[model samples]
Target: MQIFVKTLTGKTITLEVEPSDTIENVKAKIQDKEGIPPDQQRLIFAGKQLEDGRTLSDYNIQKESTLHLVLR
Candidate 1:
């Protein structure tokens, strides 16, 4: 699945992820592609804060859905 994530600064990063991938898993990709450390990343989708232990599918994430990405 492909995910579209946007940062607060208007930067967007596209990622190809597995449905089983956890939010923490995607954060690793964000850390590499967006330069935001996984520890400092705050990812939200559909107005809910994404939990590291949960799968994207668990949150009902869909392809091209916009995930709000924030970094500290």
Candidate 2:
């Protein structure tokens, strides 16, 4: 599935992921692409923050889902 990660400034990062992928794994991908450390990234989906240990399936994420990325 393809998902989108959008920053407050309107920057968007696209990722291809699977339902089994953990939020931490996704953060790693973001780090690789955007140089943002995993610890500094907060991913929100469906109005809730995503936990590092949890899978995308845990949040009921669907294809084309958009996750908001907040940097700390």
Candidate 3:
């Protein structure tokens, strides 16, 4: 699956990810793309922090879905 991520700075990054991609992977990817530390980042999904230290599937992210990007 592919996800189009738009940063707070208006930077857009499109990722070709696997269905097995996790929320943690997204954090690392976003951090790498934005030059930010994962420690300073937070992914909000369903009105909570996207924890689990696992992939989107660990947090119920379905396949072929898009996750809008946000930064702090």
Candidate 4:
């Protein structure tokens, strides 16, 4: 499935991933796809901090939700 996330910095990224991909994996994909650079990114979802090992299945994400990717 493909996930579209809009970062807090107003950057949008569309990631094409599989069901087995974790949320952390998605974060890396966003950084790589949108050029956010990992060091300058803080990926948060559902109002809680996200762990790199957490999968998309762990969160109740919508089909094309706009995530707030703050550059902290």
Listed in order, each prediction's TM-score against the native is 0.93, 0.97, 0.63, 0.71
Q: Per-residue lDDT tens digits of candidate 4, residues 17-72?
A: 76567766777787677776766777676687666777766676666654567776
Stronger candidate by TM-score (2 vs 3)? 2
Which prediction has the highest lDDT against the true structure? 2
Write model 1 residue lDDT over 1-72, tens digit each, in one string: 888999888888899998899889999988888676788989999899999999999998988888998777
Question: How close to the true structure is residue 58 of candidate 2, measured as C-alpha lDDT?
Answer: 91
Q: Candidate 3, residues 2-71: lDDT per residue as tens digits?
A: 7666566776677777658776777788777778777777666555567636776665755455455555
lDDT of each: 0.88, 0.95, 0.66, 0.69
Off by over 4 Å in 1: none
How many residue pairs clash per model? 0, 0, 3, 2
RMSD of each: 0.9, 0.5, 2.6, 2.1
List pairs with backbone clashes in candidate 3. 22-55, 22-56, 23-56
Ranking by TM-score: 2, 1, 4, 3
On a 0 to 1 TM-score scale, where does candidate 4 land against the true structure? 0.71
Q: After superposition, how far is residue 12 of candidate 4 from its true place, in Å?
A: 2.2
